Amino acid sequence: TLRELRGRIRSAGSIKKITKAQELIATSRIAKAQARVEAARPYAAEITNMLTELAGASALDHPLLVERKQPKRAGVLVVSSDRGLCGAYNANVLRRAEELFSLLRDEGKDPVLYVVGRKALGYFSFRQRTVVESWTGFSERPTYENAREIADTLVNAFMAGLGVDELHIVFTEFRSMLSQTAVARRAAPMEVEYVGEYSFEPDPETLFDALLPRYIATRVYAALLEAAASES
Amino acid sequence: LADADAMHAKALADAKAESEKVTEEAKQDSERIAAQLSEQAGSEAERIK
Amino acid sequence: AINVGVSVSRVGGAAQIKAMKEVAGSLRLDLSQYRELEAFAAFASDLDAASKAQLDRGARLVELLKQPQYSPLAVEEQVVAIFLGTQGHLDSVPVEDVQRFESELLEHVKASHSDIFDGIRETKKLSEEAEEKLVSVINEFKKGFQASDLEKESVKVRKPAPK
C-alpha cells in the first residue's frame, strides 16, 4: 500500500539521520577517549618504573605476587557498555569471557564474576551464572574514582583467601580506530619477570605493600579507558 | 542446637504428616478424574451409537 | 489468532451472561493495551514496576486465550477460565505452564467442586459465596500444581635470578 510505504520511507529517512548523527558523535568520542588514554599513559609508565625499582629492592613476599596453594576460584572482571548500539563490541567481550571460563573450568577453577557495564550485566542475568558485584554508570566516561573502587573490590576478594586464587580482566584493547579485539589479562597473581641490567623511605617492603594496590588500580583504569575508546 | 535439632525433627514429622495428607488428597482426585473420564467415555460411545 | 486491537464486538456486554460481564468486562482493552505496550517496550532495557506488572499479566492472558480446535468450553467453564486471568490468580504461574494450569484446574473444579459450575449455569452470576469458594479452590490447587520451577602481567626486577 502506498500509504504504508510512504510511512516506512519517512521512518527510515528519520533513522538514517539519527544513525548518521551518532556515527559522527562516535567519531568525536574516539578522539576524546584517545586523548584521555594518552593523558593517563605517562602515569602508568612511571608507576611501572617505580614498581620495578621497589620490586628490585623488595623480598617479593607480597600476596599479589604468589600463586595460591589451592586454585579454589578465579575472579573475572568483564568490561562492557551501558549505552547500546555498539554492534559486536559486547558480543566479542562476552565471547572472550566464555572462552576464558571454558579454560578456567578446564584447569579446575570456577570463575566468579565482577561486571562493568549494563549489557554484560543483562547477559549474565539471562545465563544463570551469578555476578558477585557490578558497576554500570560510567563505561563511556570512566573516571579514576570508579577504577579505584573496582580495584579495591578485586584485591579485597584476592586477599580474603569467600575469596579467589587468581583474578583476570576481559575487555577490548583499542589498537587502532580500524582494529580492536577483546583480550583477557590475568591481573593477579602477577608474574615476576627477571631481566638484565635508589634510597627508599621508610623501607622498600612498606612502599611495595602500599604501591601494588595502586598499580592494580592504574591497570584497571587503563583497561576501562581502552574499553571506552573501543566502545566508541 | 537443641532448638535447631528439635525444629529439624518437628519439620520432618510435619512434612511426612501433611505429605500423607497431600498423597491421600491426590489419590482421591485421581480416582475422581478416572471416574469423570469414564463418564466422558460413556457419552462418546453414546454419540457414536 | 484474534488480533485483539482491531477485532471488536459493538454489542459488547449485552451479548454476555452477567458472570462473564463481571470477569471479562474490559478484557479487550486490557489485551490491546498489552499489545501496544509489548510493541513499545520490546526494546526498552528496563521497565517501571507497573509496566512490568502489565507486560507480565498480558502474557498470562494471551496464554490463557490460546485454545486447541474441537475443544469447546461450556460458558460455565469459560467464566472460570477468564476469572483466573483477570483477578491475577495466574500472576504467580510461569507463562509457559499457564495452559496446563487452566486445563488441570478446570478438570479439578469439575471433579470436586461441580457446585461452582452448576451455580454459574443456573443463576448466570458469580455470587460472592461462589467467588469466595472458587478463590479457595484456586489457592488449594496452586499448592498441588507441579510447575516447571594468557599474557601475564610482570613486575620486572633489574637483578639476575637465584640458582
Add this chain to the structure above:
Amino acid sequence: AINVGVSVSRVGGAAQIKAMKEVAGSLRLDLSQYRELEAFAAFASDLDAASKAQLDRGARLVELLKQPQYSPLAVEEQVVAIFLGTQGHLD
C-alpha cells in the same frame, strides 16, 4: 557486470566443454561466497588468515573475469585465463 547468484543458465553445463567444466566447476560458488564474505568483512576490523586468503583470491578472480569491449577471447584462451585464477597462480 555479471551479478552471480541471480545470473544462471539452466540448460548450460551440459554443453560447456570438458576443460572449461574442470576449471570453472567451483568458480560460481567461489565468487558467490566471496561476495558475501566481502559484504561482511568490509565492516569488520580483522578476520582469520584462511578467510583473508579467500577474500584476496575472490578479489583477484573478479579482476580476472572483467575484460575490455570488443575483445572476445577464444575458448582455448578462456580456459587458460581461468586456470591462472582458480589454481591460485594469481595469489
Add this chain to the structure above:
Amino acid sequence: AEREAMLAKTAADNRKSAEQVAAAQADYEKEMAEARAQASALRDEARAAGRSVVDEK
C-alpha cells in the same frame, strides 16, 4: 584444654544450629516438592488411563 573445648563446642554448635535450621527448611520443602511431583504424576497417570478408556470405548 576444657576452656578451649567450651569455645570449640560453642562455635561448632552455633555453626551446626544454623546448618540444622537450614536443613529443617530444606527437608520440609524437598518433601513437599516430592509430594507435589508424586501428586501431579498420579493425577496425570489418572488422566492418561482415562484417555485410554475413552478411546477404547
Add this chain to the structure above:
Amino acid sequence: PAIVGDEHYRVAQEVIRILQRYKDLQDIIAILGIDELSEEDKQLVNRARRIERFLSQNMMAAEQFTGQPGSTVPLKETIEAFDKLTKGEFDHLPEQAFFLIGGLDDLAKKAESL
C-alpha cells in the same frame, strides 16, 4: 485564542506539539529503542504516552464496552489536567492510571488503586 481564550489555546497547541513529536519519534523508538534518545525527548515520550491515554474516556454510550458507568469532564477541569500533564506534573503516576479515566478526581482514585 480570540474565541476559546489563550489558556485553552496554549494547552491545545502544547498537547498537539507533544503528540506530533511523539509520532515523529515512534519510528526511532520501534527500531533503535527508547534509551537511545535525549533526556528531553525521552521525557516528552513519557508525557506523550500519558497524554494519549488521558485523551481516552469512559463514555456513557460505552457502558457495554467497559462495564463502568460513563463520565463528563468539565472544560475548566480538562484544561487544568492537560496544562498539568504537558508541564510534567503527573510523570510520577503510572502510565495505566490515565487510561479510560473521567478527569482528575478519577485519575487520583485510579492511581491510588494501582
Add this chain to the structure above:
Amino acid sequence: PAIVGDEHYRVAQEVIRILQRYKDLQDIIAILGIDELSEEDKQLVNRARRIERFLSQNMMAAEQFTGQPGSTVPLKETIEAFDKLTKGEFDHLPEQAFFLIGGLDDLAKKAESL
C-alpha cells in the same frame, strides 16, 4: 495432530513459531544486524537461521545443476532433526554446515568437513 500425530504437529509449530519470530525481527535485523537484539531474541535468531538453512535439501533433480548427488530423508528422521534443532542441540554448529544437506548423519559429516 489428529492426522500427523502429536509429536510431528508439536515440532512443526515450534519451527513455524521460531521462523515467525525471526521474520518479525527482520525489520530490526536489516538495519542493526543480529547483536542489537535482546539475548532471548538473539538465542532464537541463531537457531532460526539454522532451521531456515536446514529446510534446504540436495534434491535428485539438483544433480544436473550442482553435480552433487541427491538425498532422501524419511519422516521419522525429519521430525527428530527439527525436534533437536528447536530444543537447541545444534546451536554450536556453523550456519554453513546446514545448507543443501539430507538428514542428521549428513549434517554431522558436513560439520566434520568444516
